[PDB]
Amino acid sequence: LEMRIGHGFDVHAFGGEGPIIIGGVRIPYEKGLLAHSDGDVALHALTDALLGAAALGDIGKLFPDTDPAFKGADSRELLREAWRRIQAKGYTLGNVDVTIIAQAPKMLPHIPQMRVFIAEDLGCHMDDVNVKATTTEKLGFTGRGEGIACEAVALLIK
Amino acid sequence: LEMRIGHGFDVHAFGGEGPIIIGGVRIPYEKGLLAHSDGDVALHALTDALLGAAALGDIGKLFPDTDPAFKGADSRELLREAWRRIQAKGYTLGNVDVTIIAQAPKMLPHIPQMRVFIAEDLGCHMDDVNVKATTTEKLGFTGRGEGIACEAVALLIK
Amino acid sequence: LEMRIGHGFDVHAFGGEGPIIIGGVRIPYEKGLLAHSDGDVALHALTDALLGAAALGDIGKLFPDTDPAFKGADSRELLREAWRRIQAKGYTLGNVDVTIIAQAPKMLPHIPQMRVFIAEDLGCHMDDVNVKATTTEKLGFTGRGEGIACEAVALLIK
Numbered sequence: 336l337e338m339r340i341g342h343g344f345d346v347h348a349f350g351g352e353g354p355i356i357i358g359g360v361r362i363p364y365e366k367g368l369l370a371h372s373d374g375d376v377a378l379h380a381l382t383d384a385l386l387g388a389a390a391l392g393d394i395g396k397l398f399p400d401t402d403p404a405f406k407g408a409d410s411r412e413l414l415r416e417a418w419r420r421i422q423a424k425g426y427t428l429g430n431v432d433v434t435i436i437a438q439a440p441k442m443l444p445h446i447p448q449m450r451v452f453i454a455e456d457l458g459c460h461m462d463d464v465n466v467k468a469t470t471t472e473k474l475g476f477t478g479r480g481e482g483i484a485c486e487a488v489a490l491l492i493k
Numbered sequence: 494l495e496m497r498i499g500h501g502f503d504v505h506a507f508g509g510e511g512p513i514i515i516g517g518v519r520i521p522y523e524k525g526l527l528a529h530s531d532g533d534v535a536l537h538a539l540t541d542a543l544l545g546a547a548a549l550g551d552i553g554k555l556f557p558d559t560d561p562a563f564k565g566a567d568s569r570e571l572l573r574e575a576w577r578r579i580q581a582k583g584y585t586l587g588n589v590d591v592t593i594i595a596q597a598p599k600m601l602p603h604i605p606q607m608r609v610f611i612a613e614d615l616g617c618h619m620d621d622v623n624v625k626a627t628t629t630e631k632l633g634f635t636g637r638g639e640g641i642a643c644e645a646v647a648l649l650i651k
Numbered sequence: 652l653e654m655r656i657g658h659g660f661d662v663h664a665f666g667g668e669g670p671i672i673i674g675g676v677r678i679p680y681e682k683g684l685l686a687h688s689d690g691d692v693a694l695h696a697l698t699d700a701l702l703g704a705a706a707l708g709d710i711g712k713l714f715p716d717t718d719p720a721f722k723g724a725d726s727r728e729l730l731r732e733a734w735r736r737i738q739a740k741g742y743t744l745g746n747v748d749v750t751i752i753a754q755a756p757k758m759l760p761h762i763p764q765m766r767v768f769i770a771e772d773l774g775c776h777m778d779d780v781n782v783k784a785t786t787t788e789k790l791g792f793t794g795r796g797e798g799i800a801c802e803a804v805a806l807l808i809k
């Protein structure tokens with residue numbers, strides 16, 4: 336039983352009309368998120384943590400914004416595809432932990448649904464998916480309501 | 494032997510008269526920390542990493558600022574209580590690592606005491622508790638002396 | 652088989668003439684990095700994650716900027732020395748994951764070389780070293796091109 340750790344981080348700036356997509360869930364908000372994809376900060380960061388633990392780089396090394404086969408995809412498709420490739424290397428899920436960093440909107444009413452999505456997408460028990468949120472007390476780009484950041488850690492078994 | 498990873502993050506803005514409480518230790522400083530609790534950034538982040546690894550959410554899902562049974566509590570009481578509940582689910586401590594991010598005050602004279610507190614609170618060997626500090630070279634809200642951030646990772650055994 | 656987790660974080664401000672050193676690799680850029688050492692943000696953060704997992708503190712607790720035996724050293728020497736001391740306590744490498752946070756320069760052409768360096772320095776398979784990069788979408792000190800941050804997680808075996 337060999338175990339492997341992975342870390343992920345992601346940021347998107349606010350812009351345009353709401354809602355926003357975080358952890359798969361459509362959340363109502365005054366602004367939306369500027370992004371090439373659906374801008375799901377929490378799922379990008381989670382994917383990068385998963386891929387990192389499998390030493391497969393990051394999303395931008397598997398699915399280039401520029402090209403070729405994976406354009407106009409929502410972050411759940413990318414998560415599920417990354418997870419196929421991680422399973423292809425003979426890994427199974429240990430567990431994942433996600434930390435959303437945003438002044439607003441309010442995340443925790445939506446966390447149960449984020450966990451349902453992630454557990455479906457990775458085909459695991461909800462009990463192995465943890466998601467949490469925090470503000471930076473009106474400090475920083477995130478606290479000035481300029482954008483949202485997220486951190487993810489993942490553990491994989493072989 | 495199943496192992497589980499957890500991550501935590503926390504920020505508090507400076508305000509009011511010093512001292513500040515970081516990792517349990519009262520540290521002298523020109524300003525204090527604005528917070529509902531004692532504002533112990535390092536212990537919040539550690540608790541969230543612990544709870545996250547046990548898939549129990551975060552502090553704000555166990556001990557709502559709003560309510561009900563756990564108001565006006567210092568961060569060590571919250572840490573110790575979270576640790577009871579994590580033990581209640583049959584987990585024991587692997588180890589924890591804490592990273593304080595602050596331009597000032599100077600953290601490392603206080604780290605040995607922070608480790609004594611944390612090891613007591615979690616009833617473990619000092620050898621499983623690591624705490625470190627870093628500045629952001631006068632960059633960012635943290636570098637402009639606006640506040641303090643902290644990151645924690647935790648590993649739990651079952 | 653006991654396993655241990657570690658986290659690291661590091662920031663350096665831009666200044667002076669390029670190039671910059673990130674993960675051992677000399678990368679061309681309009682500015683350089685202000686630092687006492689070579690300013691290799693990615694290797695500092697990795698070292699701190701490694702040392703943290705071994706409960707040995709951080710670089711600034713093993714190799715004080717002030718003093719005594721380890722001045723004017725490039726970050727690879729420090730990484731290799733920290734790794735001797737971690738091996739001295741009977742640890743072997745699980746794996747490491749690195750996340751560079753910079754608006755520019757562009758990191759991923761250089762990641763393969765960063766992995767060659769790190770794998771050499773820790774005497775491990777490339778397959779246990781993962782490095783990735785992300786921007787913060789022009790947000791924050793990092794997005795305003797003021798500096799570069801990095802995050803590292805490490806896992807150690809005993």
Ligand SMILES: Nc1ccn([C@H]2O[C@@H](CO)[C@@H](OP(=O)(O)O)[C@H]2O)c(=O)n1
Binds near residue numbers: 401755759
């Ligand atoms: N300094 C930097 C900053 C970011 N990047 C990124 O290039 C992108 C790949 O198209 C990005 O992937 P990402 O969109 O964050 O999934 C990261 O690899 C990079 O390569 N160098």
Ligand SMILES: Nc1ccn([C@H]2O[C@@H](CO)[C@@H](OP(=O)(O)O)[C@H]2O)c(=O)n1
Binds near residue numbers: 558
């Ligand atoms: N966008 C956000 C940002 C922060 N939060 C927080 O609500 C708080 C619960 O009272 C907070 O918990 P915390 O005070 O960080 O322990 C986190 O869950 C949240 O729910 N949504």
Ligand SMILES: Nc1ccn([C@H]2O[C@@H](CO)[C@@H](OP(=O)(O)O)[C@H]2O)c(=O)n1
Binds near residue numbers: 625
């Ligand atoms: N509030 C803070 C912020 C940073 N520090 C740092 O002191 C330095 C040791 O010379 C630093 O180590 P570093 O240069 O980040 O490897 C960290 O321990 C500290 O001790 N207290």
Ligand SMILES: CC(C)=CCC/C(C)=C/COP(=O)(O)OP(=O)(O)O
Binds near residue numbers: 477633634
């Ligand atoms: C790992 C960390 C620190 C996560 C939190 C992200 C955050 C709030 C950064 C602060 O923004 P900034 O310092 O990059 O920009 P500014 O100087 O405008 O506050």
Ligand SMILES: [Zn+2]
Binds near residue numbers: 345346374375376379
């Ligand atoms: Zn993204």
Ligand SMILES: [Zn+2]
Binds near residue numbers: 503504533534
């Ligand atoms: Zn707090």
Ligand SMILES: [Zn+2]
Binds near residue numbers: 661662663691692695
């Ligand atoms: Zn440094």
